[PDB]
Amino acid sequence: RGKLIAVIGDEDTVTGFLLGGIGELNKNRHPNFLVVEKDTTINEIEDTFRQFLNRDDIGIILINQYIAEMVRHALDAHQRSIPAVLEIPSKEHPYDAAKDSILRRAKGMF
Amino acid sequence: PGGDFSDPVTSATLGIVQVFWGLDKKLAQRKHFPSVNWLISYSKYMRALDEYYDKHFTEFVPLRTKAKEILQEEEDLAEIVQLLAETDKITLEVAKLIKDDFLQQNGYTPYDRFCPFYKTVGMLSNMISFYDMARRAVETTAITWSIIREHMGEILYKLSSMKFKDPVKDGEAKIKADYAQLLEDMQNAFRSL
Amino acid sequence: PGGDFSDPVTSATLGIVQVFWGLDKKLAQRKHFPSVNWLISYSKYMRALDEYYDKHFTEFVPLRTKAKEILQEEEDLAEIVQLVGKASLAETDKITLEVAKLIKDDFLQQNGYTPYDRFCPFYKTVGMLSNMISFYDMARRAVETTAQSDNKITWSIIREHMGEILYKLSSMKFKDPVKDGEAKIKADYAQLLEDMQNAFRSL
Amino acid sequence: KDRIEIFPSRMAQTIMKARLKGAQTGRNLLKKKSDALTLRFRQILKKIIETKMLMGEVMREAAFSLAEAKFTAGDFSTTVIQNVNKAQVKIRAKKDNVAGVTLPVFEHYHEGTDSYELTGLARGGEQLAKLKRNYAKAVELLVELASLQTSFVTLDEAIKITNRRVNAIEHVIIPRIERTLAYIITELDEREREEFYRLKKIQEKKKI
Numbered sequence: 001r002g003k004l005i006a007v008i009g010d011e012d013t014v015t016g017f018l019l020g021g022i023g024e025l026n027k028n029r030h031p032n033f034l035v036v037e038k039d040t041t042i043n044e045i046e047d048t049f050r051q052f053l054n055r056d057d058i059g060i061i062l063i064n065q066y067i068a069e070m071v072r073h074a075l076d077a078h079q080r081s082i083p084a085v086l087e088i089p090s091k092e093h094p095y096d097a098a099k100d101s102i103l104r105r106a107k108g109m110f
Numbered sequence: 111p112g113g114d115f116s117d118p119v120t121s122a123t124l125g126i127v128q129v130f131w132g133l134d135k136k137l138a139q140r141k142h143f144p145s146v147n148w149l150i151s152y153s154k155y156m157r158a159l160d161e162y163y164d165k166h167f168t169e170f171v172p173l174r175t176k177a178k179e180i181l182q183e184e185e186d187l188a189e190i191v192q193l194l195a196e197t198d199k200i201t202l203e204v205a206k207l208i209k210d211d212f213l214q215q216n217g218y219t220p221y222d223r224f225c226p227f228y229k230t231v232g233m234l235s236n237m238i239s240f241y242d243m244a245r246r247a248v249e250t251t252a253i254t255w256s257i258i259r260e261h262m263g264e265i266l267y268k269l270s271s272m273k274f275k276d277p278v279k280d281g282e283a284k285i286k287a288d289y290a291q292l293l294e295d296m297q298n299a300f301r302s303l
Numbered sequence: 304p305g306g307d308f309s310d311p312v313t314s315a316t317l318g319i320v321q322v323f324w325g326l327d328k329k330l331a332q333r334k335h336f337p338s339v340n341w342l343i344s345y346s347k348y349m350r351a352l353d354e355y356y357d358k359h360f361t362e363f364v365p366l367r368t369k370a371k372e373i374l375q376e377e378e379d380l381a382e383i384v385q386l387v388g389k390a391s392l393a394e395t396d397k398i399t400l401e402v403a404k405l406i407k408d409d410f411l412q413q414n415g416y417t418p419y420d421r422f423c424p425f426y427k428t429v430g431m432l433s434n435m436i437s438f439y440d441m442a443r444r445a446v447e448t449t450a451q452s453d454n455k456i457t458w459s460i461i462r463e464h465m466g467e468i469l470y471k472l473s474s475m476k477f478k479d480p481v482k483d484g485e486a487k488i489k490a491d492y493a494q495l496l497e498d499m500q501n502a503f504r505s506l
Numbered sequence: 507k508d509r510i511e512i513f514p515s516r517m518a519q520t521i522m523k524a525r526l527k528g529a530q531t532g533r534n535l536l537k538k539k540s541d542a543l544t545l546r547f548r549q550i551l552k553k554i555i556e557t558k559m560l561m562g563e564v565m566r567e568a569a570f571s572l573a574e575a576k577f578t579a580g581d582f583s584t585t586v587i588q589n590v591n592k593a594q595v596k597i598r599a600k601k602d603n604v605a606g607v608t609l610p611v612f613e614h615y616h617e618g619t620d621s622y623e624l625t626g627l628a629r630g631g632e633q634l635a636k637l638k639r640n641y642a643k644a645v646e647l648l649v650e651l652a653s654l655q656t657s658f659v660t661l662d663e664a665i666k667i668t669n670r671r672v673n674a675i676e677h678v679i680i681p682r683i684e685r686t687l688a689y690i691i692t693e694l695d696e697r698e699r700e701e702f703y704r705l706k707k708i709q710e711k712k713k714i
Contacts, residue, residue, distance in 0.1 A: 001615050003597040005645075015583035016572050019622075019634065020641025021595035035587065059597045059612065060652045081610050081659050084652040088561065091569040095562055102655050106551065106662070116516040135521070189528030190535060193675070194606065309693075386674050 003059025006052050007033040008045065008067055010090050017062070032058070042070050049074055053083055060084045065096040075101055115150070129153040144215040148182065167231060173238050180241060181205055196248045199255035204241045207266070211273055212237065221276040228282050232289040233272050239293065240269065243300055250303045262299045268292050322346040337413050341374060360425070366432045370406065373439065377403035394446045397458045402439045409473055410435060419479050426485060430492045431475065437496060438472065441503045456506065465502045471495055510686045514693040522690070526683050533675050540668040543605055547661050550654060557651050564647060568640040575637050578630035585624060594619035595645060602657065607664045609657040614649045 005022045007014055014035045017023065024032045032055075034048050049071055052058045065087050068075060075085060089096040103109055111117040114133075124130060134147040163171070184205035187198050212234065216222040246252055259266070272292070275285040304310055306328055317323060323344055330338035356364050376399055380392070389397075410431060414420045442461060449456045462469070475495065478488050512518050575582070598615035601608050624634055 001596045001617060002599045003612075004593060005595075005597060005649075011583060011587075012569065012572060015586050016568060016637065016641055017645070018586050018590060019638050020645050021638075022593060022645060023590050024593040025590055031590075059599070060649065062648065079659075081656055084612075084656045086648060086652060088565055088648075091566075091573075100558075102554070102658075106658075109551075110555075113516055115520070135517075189525075190532050193529060193532040386678065388670070 002057065004032050004057050005060045005062065006058050007062050008048065009036065009062070009064040009088070011035050011037070012091055013064060013088070026057075036064070036067060046071050046074055053078065058083065060086070062086045062088060064093070065089045066093060069099075124150070129155060139214075142214060144213050146213065148178075148185065167227075169235060170231060173234065176242070177208070177234070177238060180238075181208070196253075196255040197245060200241070200244055200258070203255065203259070204237075204244075207240075207269060208237060211270055220278050221274045224277060226277060226282060229275075229277060229285055232286050236272070236289050236293050236296070237269060240265075240296060250300050253303070258303065261303055262296075265292075265296055265299055268295070322348060335407075335412060336415070337411065339411070341411075342378060360429055362433070363429045366429070366436050369436050369439075370410075370432065373399060373403055374406065394450075394456075394458060395443065398439075398442050398446060398461075401458065401462075402435070402442075405438075405469075405472065406435060409476055419477050422480065424480055424485075427476075427478070427480070427488065430489065434472065434475065434492055434496060438499060441499065445503055445506060464506065465499070468495075468499055468502055471498075508682065508685060509689060510682055512686070514690045516694075519687065519690050519694075522683055522687055526680070526687075529675065529679055529683070533672065536668065536672050536675065539606065540665065540672055543661065543665045543668060546604060547658070547665055550658055550661070554651065554655060554658075557647070557654070561644070561647055561651065564640070564644045568637070568644055571633070571637050571640050575630060575633035578633045579627035582624055582627040582634075585626065586622070589622065592619045593617060594621060595642075597649065600653075605664070607660065609660050611653040611657050612649055613653075614646050 004024045007017050007022065009017075014033055018033075026032070032052075034045070036045070045067060049061075049063075052061060059082070061083055063085060068085075068087055085101075087096050087100050111119070114120065129152075131151050132147045133143075133145045134149075137145065180201060184202050187202065191198070191202065215225075244250065244258065248254060269292070272289065275288060277285065308314075308325075323346075325340045325343050326338050327340040328338070330340075353364065380396060380400065383392075384400075413423065415422075445461070446456055472495070475492065478491070510522075512522075594617060596615050596617040598613040600611050600613050602611050603609070621638065625631070
């Protein structure tokens with residue numbers, strides 16, 4: 001209820017998750033998501049990420065792996081409990097199995 | 111003396127005197143004259159007087175023990191607080207109220223110049239019944255302490271201001287009635303908690 | 304005996320003398336040769352000298368005062384540093400810590416065996432103190448002006464921007480009294496002050 | 507500073523003994539609390555990587571079902587992305603006070619807005635329903651993992667704070683107290699010895 005999950009991924013992730021149960025337009029007619037394409041650059045990904053961070057009703061952020069690598073500095077610099085950022089691979093992109101900050105902050109793991 | 115506990119006079123005196131009361135370590139409040147030092151404050155006449163007490167007052171019999179339990183529990187937990195569950199907070203705030211109201215008698219004002227035993231019984235019964243039905247859990251019975259305080263601040267002020275009922279002009283009946291009304295207010299607050 | 308101040312000798316002595324210079328062994332163990340405990344020393348002749356300064360060194364009087372409060376605040380903050388690490392203090396606290404460090408390292412340290420510091424003329428001392436307090440004033444003004452800005456300055460930014468100036472501040476005391484006129488030293492100190500003002504203007 | 511400033515007296519000794527006992531007990535309790543927090547830290551860390559493997563497997567299953575639906579339908583995605591009105595799954599903020607500090611966790615709160623009948627792209631309704639189910643499971647699993655790691659963050663921050671406090675109490679206060687006690691004992695011994703010497707001298711003179 002209180003929070004609305006955001007998504008930042010290539011077309012197949014976005015269309016799959018919108019049918020999945022999530023996604024929303026606020027009263028201001030603003031997407032809580034973003035479809036990335038090959039033409040997308042880093043700055044607007046960063047801008048939307050920060051806009052979501054300031055948006056109180058995000059809660060949980062799901063982003064693709066390579067997108068996270070585009071704005072890795074934004075993830076590492078920002079440290080808070082509320083914005084639960086995640087990492088998911090796309091269909092053609094291989095499995096994500098490392099370089100996750102949540103594992104990095106717990107260095108004592110494997 | 112400078113060496114309160116280490117004075118030879120004090121050591122010899124504690125070997126003879128049947129009933130002794132003493133000041134605690136010299137507190138920040140130099141005017142804390144009615145203090146109490148649980149390390150060495152004791153009596154030796156409980157045995158020869160309980161039979162007399164039973165015929166006049168009987169409510170106090172467990173209350174006198176419970177007050178000591180509360181005070182010693184606070185004394186145990188205080189040093190840990192200085193260096194934190196809500197029940198701890200209830201215990202310490204009750205003990206602070208007891209020290210601030212039951213102790214620290216004025217004497218030089220009429221409203222604490224003298225106190226009949228019945229006035230003490232009533233005020234102590236109210237002050238301890240506050241704790242007897244607030245420690246049954248973090249709630250009223252099995253929220254937090256801050257919630258209890260925010261709910262019953264006026265109650266705490268009235269508990270503190272019990273002291274000012276002057277026995278000189280107010281008879282025993284009137285002070286007892288005021289205390290009982292305050293107890294009923296506390297009960298009403300407990301029901302709404 | 305034992306380095307303690309409880310023996311009757313010192314207790315009797317302090318009851319008569321008007322000015323006291325306690326020496327702390329810890330400073331001596333870390334090679335801070337003029338080992339003066341500024342925290343406990345006291346002089347009762349602070350009065351009856353204001354007029355001498357009024358006619359010679361009028362500017363000097365508030366400078367030492369300011370130095371005393373910065374050291375006192377450093378002492379009050381030092382234990383909070385000891386039990387609580389850094390990164391929990393405002394920028395004013397950190398810059399005051401740095402200024403205290405600079406005061407200790409340079410204004411207090413004096414090596415009587417070196418040719419350049421075997422004796423300090425008064426004008427050298429007041430010039431140094433003026434330079435240091437001017438630095439503290441400018442830095443505090445810079446941080447407080449940008450306190451409410453979206454680009455608030457931090458101690459690291461200041462240190463990187465003008466670290467060479469900090470080296471100059473540390474090294475100003477390597478000047479002889481002989482083979483170096485007072486005018487030359489004063490000119491160098493004024494030039495350094497002007498460089499500092501330029502560095503603060505550029506920000 | 508290495509010696510706490512207080513004049514030697516018997517009551518200084520008693521007060522310092524009491525403070526020593528209190529500090530020792532407080533250190534023990536603080537170490538205990540750190541131990542409990544670290545136990546929880548290890549326990550919730552029993553599996554995030556395995557939940558990550560499960561996330562990957564479920565995501566790939568959903569992607570394969572999406573590929574099948576794409577074969578059946580072709581160009582539903584544009585229709586889906588253009589028409590987004592109201593969310594049918596939202597998140598409830600929740601708290602779990604497992605220790606002295608409170609941890610943030612979340613719940614999969616099914617708000618319940620009706621789904622979208624997509625009956626235009628050759629109408630592979632079976633494929634769309636299967637896709638919706640699979641992505642719903644994926645969302646639930648992802649919410650669970652998010653709650654887990656979100657609590658984990660606050661947990662390890664509290665742990666580091668408590669460990670730092672433990673070290674601070676251990677390596678500073680106690681040595682100072684022990685040094686003060688030794689100094690006090692020495693000074694009292696000196697006073698007693700001096701008194702003994704005075705008494706010896708007065709007896710010596712009295713022998714005449």
